[PDB]
Design a protein around this ligand. Structure first.
Ligand code: GDP
Lengths: 320, 22
């Protein structure tokens, strides 16, 4: 039995859980209408969480509302924060969010999300407020993809594709179950390291000794060069390319790499970053890296990228 | 190597006030 073990690694918010969900959609018939119903509350919760996160950031970043009236909605939001913990988003709550998301001050703060920590499901949910606020609303599969869930252990998914048995593990941030956790690192066919390209312009936070991209690099450096992984494919998912492309128009890559003398085209930057990662591989004669530029929330893109990742696996054990 | 630690620390930093339990 040729059985394939895949381990997802990468900093938090790099798209790991999304890739997992994406395998369920692409290779395991997705989510049934029942399951979609179960994420109703999650969608509502994340929406509430997302708008709160911006509101709270306004206080810290010292940004006034566009219209002074919104102060009431801010106060109203915290009162109503729990309203959706079952089913409906009351009409009253939807208007609060609608009016806040509209406001010029809130927006200025949303533009400045590099200056704090705003999740990338935020605008997806908020721009579709009108749609999700209907009482009859059933989450679409794209809505489920965009859900942000706390996990407290190892996430696993399994499927059969091209006559091969795939087991994929997103080992969490919790070693609160070692051994099973350590095992996820054992007998791996391919490691898939995710990088949020769009982190390149994030401000150096007060709890960091280097920016997020270099943290991702340091991490990749150690995975890539670990003697345990000599016989394991290293696959690099430079992810969030959609966001990266928009950002790079405005924020120079020199923000992330001061020494960078290239240009702020999507093409030239993405290539520079790839090089920064791939140069970390210190065994180039005995190992090569498989870089892919992905948008993990885009089912069609992932299908294609994963299809290609599989083709290499097939062509691999036909040699070895 | 402190290799397992480094990973543990990295992947845990994922905006928990903006995620929800299931
Ligand atoms: N716009 C965009 N959003 C993404 C992309 N990949 C992930 N996200 C979102 O970014 C956040 C982090 O993704 P997640 O898979 O939870 O990262 P993890 O922390 O490594 O599991 C989630 O809100 C995702 O829905 C992408 O390529 N583009």
């Amino acid at each position: 039995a040729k059985e394939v073990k895949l381990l997802l690694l990468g900093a938090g918010e790099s798209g790991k859980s999304t890739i997992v969900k994406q395998m369920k959609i692409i290779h395991e018939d997705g989510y049934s209408e029942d399951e979609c119903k179960q994420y109703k509350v999650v969608v509502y919760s994340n929406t509430i969480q997302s708008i709160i996160a911006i509101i709270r950031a306004m206080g810290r970043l010292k940004i006034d509302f566009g219209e002074a009236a919104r102060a009431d909605d801010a106060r109203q939001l915290f009162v109503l924060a729990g309203s959706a913990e079952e089913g409906v988003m009351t009409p009253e709550l939807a208007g609060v969010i609608k009016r806040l998301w509209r406001d010029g001050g809130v927006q200025a703060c949303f533009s400045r999300s590099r200056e704090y920590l705003l999740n990338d499901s935020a605008s997806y949910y908020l721009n579709d407020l009108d749609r999700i606020s209907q009482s009859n609303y059933i989450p679409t599969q794209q809505d489920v993809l965009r859900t942000r869930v706390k996990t407290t252990g190892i996430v696993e998914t399994h499927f059969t594709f091209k006559d091969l048995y795939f087991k994929m593990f997103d080992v969490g941030g919790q070693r609160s179950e070692r051994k099973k956790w350590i095992h996820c690192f054992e007998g791996v066919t391919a490691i898939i390291f995710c990088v949020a390209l769009s982190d390149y312009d994030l401000v150096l936070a007060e709890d960091e000794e280097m920016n997020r991209m270099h943290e991702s690099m340091k991490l990749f450096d150690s995975i890539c060069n670990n003697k345990w992984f000599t016989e394991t494919s290293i696959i690099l998912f430079l992810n969030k390319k959609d966001l990266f492309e928009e950002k790079i128009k405005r924020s120079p890559l020199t923000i992330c790499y001061p020494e960078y003398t290239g240009s702020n085209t999507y093409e030239e930057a993405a290539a520079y970053i790839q090089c920064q990662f791939e140069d970390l591989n210190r065994r180039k004669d005995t190992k090569e890296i498989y870089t892919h530029f992905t948008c993990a929330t885009d089912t069609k893109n992932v299908q294609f990228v994963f299809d290609a990742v599989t083709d290499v696996i097939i062509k691999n054990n036909l040699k070895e | 190597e402190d290799f397992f630690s480094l990973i543990l620390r990295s992947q845990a930093k994922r905006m928990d006030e903006q995620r929800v339990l299931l």
